[PDB]
């Protein structure tokens, strides 16, 4: 924990367009969520003209962003500029150096992704439940980005279920009506396929006689 | 057996 810079120095370091809050979003970079009340208190302090002021914000504490302090899952539905402010890694690490981070609490680090016309911090990636067709209850939950391909989902299901190289496998998604949609195209993304957290993704394996299990299902 | 009871939504 480094000596606190002067107020104007902190403002510039944390806000500037090179290394601070105004830095453009670039795919792959890390950004961190800061609970908005803390950041506004820091802003009032550094704009307040009194380095000794009681408006000093104290340790960063993102407690209100988490569902609980057991698994530290982010609350759903958080809104940038209302619940939290985004800072790039350099600015987050400076703020932690200066003010500290609440003891025992993990940072909230998220990555920029590239969408067709925009870059965005992916605050909420997609957790998919991967299962074999023969046992829909034995799942492995795996996090994927919205920009990952369906092919990566399938390769991941094959790895997690120890599918052998010569076995043939293909994916299905269980939809909200309770039926199955075939994921024919491995080149499209998780976003293109409209997959959602908690969704069941079924890896079907071709039988050794060359027929597929799904031939037996009502179409 | 659950998979075999599920319906396949024919694509458009």
Author numbering:
A (entry chain A): 29 to 247
B (entry chain D): 3 to 14
The study reports:
Human ubiquitin-specific protease 11 (USP11) is best known for its role in DNA damage repair by homologous recombination (HR).
Co-crystallization trials of USP11_DU in the presence of the FYLIR peptide yielded monoclinic crystals of space group P21 that diffracted to 1.3 Å resolution after optimization. The DUSP and UBL domains in the peptide complex structure are arranged in tandem, analogous to the structures of the rat USP11 ortholog and homologs USP4 (SGC) and USP15 (21, 22), but unlike the previous structure of human USP11_DU. Unexpectedly, the structure revealed that the peptide occupied an elongated cleft in the USP11 UBL domain, with clear electron density for peptide residues Gly-3–Arg-14 observed in both copies of the asymmetric unit. The peptide's main interacting core comprises nine residues (residues 5–13; FYKLKIRTP), with a buried interaction interface area of ∼750 Å2. Phe-5, which can be described as the first tooth of the bidentate-like interaction, is nearly completely buried by occupying a hydrophobic pocket (referred to as major pocket). The loop between strands S3 and S4 in the UBL domain (S3S4 loop, residues Asn-203–Ser-207) becomes less flexible in the peptide-bound structure due to interactions of USP11 Glu-205 with the peptide's Arg-11.
